[PDB]
């Protein structure tokens, strides 16, 4: 088992970012390697379809307790679905999956569409529009409503900012950092607000619609016959829409892709099924999740080495989505590649891999793709706009992935045939 040197390589991982793991595989000439991080903890980095298949074998890999605690404290919440494994996890995961009906998915589609259409005037009136910011505010509107949570309009900008702080809080991979305290306080504010809504729902003082997250989470009973305690219930209720709001990252990246590859715009407009392919390709190509932590429960034989019991595991998300053998030209943006993708659970893993129901794989992938379809269709078809000189760099050596400027547009004008 080959190794990246030192006693602790955390600073080096942060310096190389999304390119760390691939830099190490190239220079060490291997598909699998160990490194130490987060204070001398050994992690074996696995990649590709075989890496993802093993990482999602529950007989042999633990996820519980493996997330850095500071990231639990800011991004997910204590006792969240991401923190639990086994029967308890499967049971609670089914509640999340139960929201993803045909009707509820068709509703998030309609909400996204209506709100972009309703936002056109505002964007015309602005001197410039930072798409990262504008989209995070619009998606807070979409997400709170889809989840059955009432958010007064005066509070939407605050809530969006709080979510943004939480979403960004994996940047130090669990280390201390300047905004850590502010990040916890943002989370507290959002948990308190949601707990109040769960309490008032259970008390019968408010009446969210049946099939909404707030309704279904407030009333659900676990497999032993118990509802969640109200704080846990608020924490997991946030997990139904904070990551929806995080789609703003992908909205910024999608406008970037359309600007860099103007042929895509035309095809999103003219071509059936293309908005779907474009959305998939934003998720594959652009950086968001670098890797995911786990632990070997037992010795594991893998690609010619033995991973000892008790050692950490890191599934390389960026590496897999950018694997030369899986995608032919992994560093080119080419939506047509999805004409031949066979739907594997183990290659297109930007929001995880494996099985939705028994693994920690994202419950929100359909929603992500639907929002990205409708949002890219809007920007491609419904408005024209200019793109000013600005800093469009996406620095692959810096976690998290952002367009430096946020992606700014100007001179927004609705497309209307008035003849
Ligand atoms: C915006 C981009 C999104 C990204 C990058 C993202 C990424 C991910 C990742 C990496 C995981 C963990 C996979 C694992 O641990 O094996 C995950 C889990 C999760 N995602 Fe997402 N996701 C996004 C959007 C959404 C949306 C829109 C929702 C809900 C509407 C959602 C709900 C969740 C839930 C509930 C889990 C936990 C499932 C579990 O622990 O079993 N995600 N997501
Ligand atoms: C080379 C490695 C050492 C690995 C160390 C382990 C680091 C843990 C990294 C966890 C990063 C998880 C980021 C996931 C972000 C989910 C999308 C955001 C949506 C949401 O708000 O939940």
Residue numbers in the entry: 4 to 422
Quoted from the paper:
Among the best characterized of the CYP152 family peroxygenases is the industrially relevant OleTJE (CYP152L1), first isolated from Jeotgalicoccus sp. ATCC 8456 in 2011 by Schirmer and co-workers. OleTJE acts primarily as a H2O2-dependent fatty acid decarboxylase to form terminal alkenes but also hydroxylates a proportion of these substrates to generate α- and β-hydroxylated fatty acids. Crystal structure data show that the active sites of OleTJE and P450 BSβ are very similar, with the carboxylate group of fatty acid substrates being coordinated by a conserved arginine residue (Arg245 in OleTJE, Arg242 in P450 BSβ, and Arg241 in P450 SPα). In this study, we explore further the structure and mechanism of OleTJE by mutating the key active site residues His85, Phe79, and Arg245 and by analyzing their effects on the catalytic properties of this biotechnologically important alkene-producing enzyme.
Crystals were obtained for both the H85Q and F79A mutant P450s in complex with arachidic acid substrate, as well as for the WT OleTJE in conditions containing formate. Structures for these mutant enzymes were determined to 1.44 Å (WT/formate), 1.80 Å (H85Q/arachidic acid) and 1.95 Å (F79A/arachidic acid). Arachidic acid substrate is bound similarly in both the H85Q and F79A mutants as was previously reported for the WT OleTJE. In contrast, for both OleTJE H85Q/F79A mutant structures, a sixth ligand water molecule is clearly visible. The H85Q mutant was found to generate a product profile very similar to that for the wild type OleTJE for all substrates tested. However, UV-visible binding studies demonstrate that substrate-induced H85Q HS heme accumulation is much lower than in the WT OleTJE in all cases. The LS heme iron signals for the H85Q mutant are quite distinct from those for WT OleTJE in both the substrate-free and arachidic acid-bound forms, indicating that the H85Q mutation alters the environment of the distal pocket around the heme iron, e.g. through altering the hydrogen bonding network to the distal water ligand in the LS substrate-free form. The similarity in product profiles between WT and H85Q OleTJE suggests that His85 is not crucial for proton transfer to transient heme iron-oxo species to facilitate C–C bond scission and alkene production or that alternative pathway(s) exist in the H85Q mutant.
